[model samples]
Target: MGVSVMEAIKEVKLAEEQAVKEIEEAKNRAEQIKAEAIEEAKKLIAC
Candidate 1:
């Protein structure tokens, strides 16, 4: 109804977007770590 309310809503939307992006980045990092672990395990097994 007021400028303050609109600003609050905008901040909330921005925060939500940032949170979603962080979650996706975390998931990608986890996958990358898992792949690296698998590769290391294979190398160790060959030794």
Candidate 2:
């Protein structure tokens, strides 16, 4: 419960940060796809 334990605890934070980033990227990807799809709606303007 000294330096090695402290290092492990801090390393867990780094690991979780990476996980959160990946989850965030995954979460936004659907919104990004929707945003791209919005551009196609312009083709309906001729109606």
Candidate 3:
């Protein structure tokens, strides 16, 4: 019984780590999108 509990805890921890990594990746992608939008706006105004 104790072994199963330990295994469950390990699985939860692994899931948590994966979620954190995904969040970071999403944030980076968001930043890139914002940067691209800004550049496109600037080009439009420059014309």
Q: List per-prediction Cα lDDT, in the order shown.
A: 0.74, 0.75, 0.74
Number of the candidate with higher lDDT, 2 or 3: 2
Estimate the overall C-alpha local distance difference test score of candidate 2: 0.75
Question: Which segments of candidate 1 are over 4 A away from where they belong?
Answer: 1-12, 36-47
Candidate 1 per-residue C-alpha lDDT over 1-47 given as tens digits, one digit per residue, 9 for 90 to 100? 54656455565566577789988998898788679768878766855
lDDT of 1 at 4: 55
By lDDT, the best candidate is: 2
RMSD of each: 6.4, 6.0, 6.6
For model 3, the stretches where C-alpha displacement exceeds 4 angstroms are 1-12, 34-47
* Decoy 2 TM-score against native: 0.44
Residue 46, candidate 3: C-alpha displacement in angstroms: 25
Clashes of 2: 0
**Compared with the true structure, what per-residue lDDT tens digits does model 3 show for residues 1-47?**
33556455565566677789988998898888779768878767855
In order of listing, the candidates' clash counts read: 0, 0, 0
Lowest lDDT block of 10, candidate 1: 1-10
Better of 2 and 3 by TM-score: 2
Q: Name the candidate that leads on TM-score.
A: 2
